[PDB]
Symmetry: C6
Subunit: 80 residues, 6 copies
Amino acid sequence: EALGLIETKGLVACIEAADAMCAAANVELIGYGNVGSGLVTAMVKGDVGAVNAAVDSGVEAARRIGEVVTSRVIARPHND
Amino acid sequence: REALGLIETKGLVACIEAADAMCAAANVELIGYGNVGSGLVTAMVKGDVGAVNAAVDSGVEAARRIGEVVTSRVIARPHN
Amino acid sequence: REALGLIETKGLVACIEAADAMCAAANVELIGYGNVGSGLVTAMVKGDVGAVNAAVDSGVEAARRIGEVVTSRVIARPHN
Amino acid sequence: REALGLIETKGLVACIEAADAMCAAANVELIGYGNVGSGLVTAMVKGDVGAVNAAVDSGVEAARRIGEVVTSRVIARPHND
Amino acid sequence: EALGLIETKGLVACIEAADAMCAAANVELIGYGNVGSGLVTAMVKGDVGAVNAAVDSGVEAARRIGEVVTSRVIARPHND
Amino acid sequence: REALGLIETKGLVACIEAADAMCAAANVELIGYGNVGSGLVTAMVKGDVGAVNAAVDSGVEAARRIGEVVTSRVIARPHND
């Protein structure tokens, strides 16, 4: 399954990105990843069409709240 | 099926104040705190959307007296 | 059912000094420390509101000699 | 008894991409990630030195599109780990 | 027992401070305290004369290596 | 009764390089790493003071190629640890 990734500065922007990802398309929230320095990543799972649509509006919603530092869709992940 | 209120502050003391002012302002229940490092700490509350909007509103006002409020949000119908 | 005193400092050593000076100043009980990274460390005390106000007052005075007092607060009637 | 490739990025998303791009580029095996705070995250791969050199090369190219590649390295014959 | 505290930017300066404290006088290393942001604290225990001599040359030693951000001797700690 | 060698770097990859070059340079044994956040991570080695001085010396040279060496130290007769 494809993997969608949005990393934000701060936890609240990330929760919003994750909520907007799961509202926008048929993706499943995998969880969050925190590496300190305020960087938090929301991770979603689905078909590449859904994941591309989820990440797209996850990024738009998060930018209203705060800092989106990077985002990515990986259509065919090798690990995880 | 409960709304979610979120206040993120720079520092723990502003966050405790935000959480205390949220719980004093309306019929919301504190879920806990979330810390992602960099000094960013998030208070999270639960309730009906009217109560949550009133708590976050005065939670933000109280915290700003103490310190830095970096972001806030009410999510009326959270997906995850 | 007890008031709460809070001092957040830049660095661990100032915080230990604030906490020692709080507990020497009045009949307050150290609850523990809270660390949210970024060097921010919070000393937390418990007592009647008169004692807690006297503890925090001289806790802040002591810590400022050593280092940075970034925020402080007395919550006379904490909700959590 | 195997070479080690290392890519350190600013942020978690660049690192996952580097790790995905390393494992797609050559016959390397992801060992895991290492996080030391300050946003610095390191993907670590294992393989023969030819494969590991090719994985890191394109891992760095992939990550740089996404974000900050702060350092990278191939250790052909590691003494520890 | 008195408590001596040296906080440095970085782990190597702190290990150096702790080694120089314990070499200078009859103090006993309690451990380290790390609160992130690179701040690390060496803590020693002993009679107040020893702890004052330990902290003094721990501070001198650490400064050769790196950044000493604060230091303190607490002659009669109320907690810990 | 053994000396301690210490190299602290900004970032995990420089530190692994320092640690590998310490163990390649002399008869020292890697104790482990120490991370205090802010990107600062420390390689720690054990051995006779001559070996430890030789290891730390070239551990620092190797790491400086990759990244930032923020501090280093040899403690010939450590009181604790």
